[PDB]
Amino acid sequence: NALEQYGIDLTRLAAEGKLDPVIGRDEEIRRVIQILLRRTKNNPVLIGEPGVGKTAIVEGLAQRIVKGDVPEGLKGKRIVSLQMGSLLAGAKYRGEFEERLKAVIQEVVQSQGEVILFIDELHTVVGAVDAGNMLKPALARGELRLIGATTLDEYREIEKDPALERRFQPVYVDEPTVEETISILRGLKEKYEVHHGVRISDSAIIAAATLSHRYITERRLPDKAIDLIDEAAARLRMALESAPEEIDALERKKLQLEIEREALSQERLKAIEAEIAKLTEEIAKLRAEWEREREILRKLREAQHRLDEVRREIELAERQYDLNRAAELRYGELPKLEAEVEALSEKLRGARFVRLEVTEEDIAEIVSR
Numbered sequence: 448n449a450l451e452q453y454g455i456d457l458t459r460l461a462a463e464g465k466l467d468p469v470i471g472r473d474e475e476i477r478r479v480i481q482i483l484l485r486r487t488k489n490n491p492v493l494i495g496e497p498g499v500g501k502t503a504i505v506e507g508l509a510q511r512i513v514k515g516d517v518p519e520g521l522k523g524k525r526i527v528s529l530q531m532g533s534l535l536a537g538a539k540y541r542g543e544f545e546e547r548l549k550a551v552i553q554e555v556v557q558s559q560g561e562v563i564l565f566i567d568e569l570h571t572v573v574g575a576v577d578a579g580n581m582l583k584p585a586l587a588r589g590e591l592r593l594i595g596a597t598t599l600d601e602y603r604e605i606e607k608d609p610a611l612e613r614r615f616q617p618v619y620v621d622e623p624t625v626e627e628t629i630s631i632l633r634g635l636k637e638k639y640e641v642h643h644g645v646r647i648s649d650s651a652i653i654a655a656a657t658l659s660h661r662y663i664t665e666r667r668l669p670d671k672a673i674d675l676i677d678e679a680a681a682r683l684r685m686a687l688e689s690a691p692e693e694i695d696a697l698e699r700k701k702l703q704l705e706i707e708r709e710a711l712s713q714e715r716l717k718a719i720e721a722e723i724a725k726l727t728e729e730i731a732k733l734r735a736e737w738e739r740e741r742e743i744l745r746k747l748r749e750a751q752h753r754l755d756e757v758r759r760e761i762e763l764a765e766r767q768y769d770l771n772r773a774a775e776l777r778y779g780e781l782p783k784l785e786a787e788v789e790a791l792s793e794k795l796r797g798a799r800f801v802r803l804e805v806t807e808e809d810i811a812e813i814v815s816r
């Protein structure tokens with residue numbers, strides 16, 4: 448099956464609730480639906496800078512299809528994202544790539560309008576690695592629909608081809624504002640907390656949006672803001688795995704006294720031998736206290752993962768209109784897991800060694816580099 452070998456089925460991933468939430472972009476999703484439902488030039492091409500959210504728009508659409516929140520003409524449709532890496536992989540001889548892509552196109556044509564092909568980085572497929580000829584007839588006859596994604600400066604070149612400009616409909620995707628980015632981050636926050644096993648403050652989110660907008664001009668919202676949060680969460684996770692600085696400070700202080708004892712005056716020996724024992728004893732106490740905190744962190748993390756699955760189960764039940772199951776979870780397991788997550792988080796707020804929450808300070812530090 449060429450479609451599965453060389454594509455990822457975004458509607459299947461949406462049905463299994465495996466795509467991240469898509470926040471806003473309602474206007475852009477409606478526009479794509481509207482174009483797909485025309486008889487001619489019904490192949491929308493998302494045009495916008497890298498990281499702006501073109502792929503997320505297509506994923507939002509797959510979600511709407513699977514829920515059935517689409518007009519009649521799009522009910523039951525699949526969106527398959529073409530995988531250029533899979534097509535090129537092990538294609539050593541001329542004719543292999545071309546044969547693979549024709550198998551994919553043939554399967555799309557065979558589906559009789561039920562499969563819509565999403566082609567990210569469209570310019571890499573049509574233009575000077577050249578496969579425009581293989582798609583053109585199917586487009587012309589209306590037997591194949593596609594969604595494209597590309598940048599403006601590269602669409603300028605695709606547009607020069609007169610056959611394609613009548614088939615494709617440009618959709619210009621602007622970068623979200625700081626406000627919209629904050630909303631996007633708030634919507635994605637739980638995924639990052641669950642993955643990294645940490646918590647992320649709202650002010651860290653505000654800072655990631657604001658500081659990336661202001662200082663990281665060579666990249667786009669919301670990607671750069673998400674990246675700042677992701678990196679800050681990964682670093683806090685890594686810091687939580689390592690020995691805390693306070694236990695580390697005693698440990699290095701002990702080593703100095705151990706090196707100093709190699710030099711040695713009797714009163715100076717007995718005072719430091721007694722000091723090494725005190726530090727050994729202190730390290731022992733704080734290490735046990737740290738293990739305790741670490742096990743509360745483990746429980747919090749288990750509770751986070753369970754909460755995340757329960758939300759997916761709720762979302763899935765709602766889409767299926769299994770109203771009993773949705774209510775069973777919403778009024779039972781959900782508030783139970785939510786209270787456990789909050790209570791364990793609060794316990795860690797008064798922790799000696801575990802700092803659980805990513806702060807605006809963490810964000811500012813990455814932005815400086």
Ligand SMILES: Nc1ncnc2c1ncn2[C@@H]1O[C@H](COP(=O)(O)OP(=O)(O)O)[C@@H](O)[C@H]1O
Pocket residue numbers: 467468469470471472495496497498499500501502503504596631634635669670673
């Ligand atoms: N409206 C949105 N809701 C949720 N996440 C978004 C949204 N727009 C962009 N993102 C996220 O920001 C990052 C960049 O988006 P992406 O679709 O990959 O950009 P592009 O395809 O334009 O390069 C991705 O992690 C994506 O999931």
Ligand SMILES: [Cl-]
Pocket residue numbers: 473474477
């Ligand atoms: Cl809408």
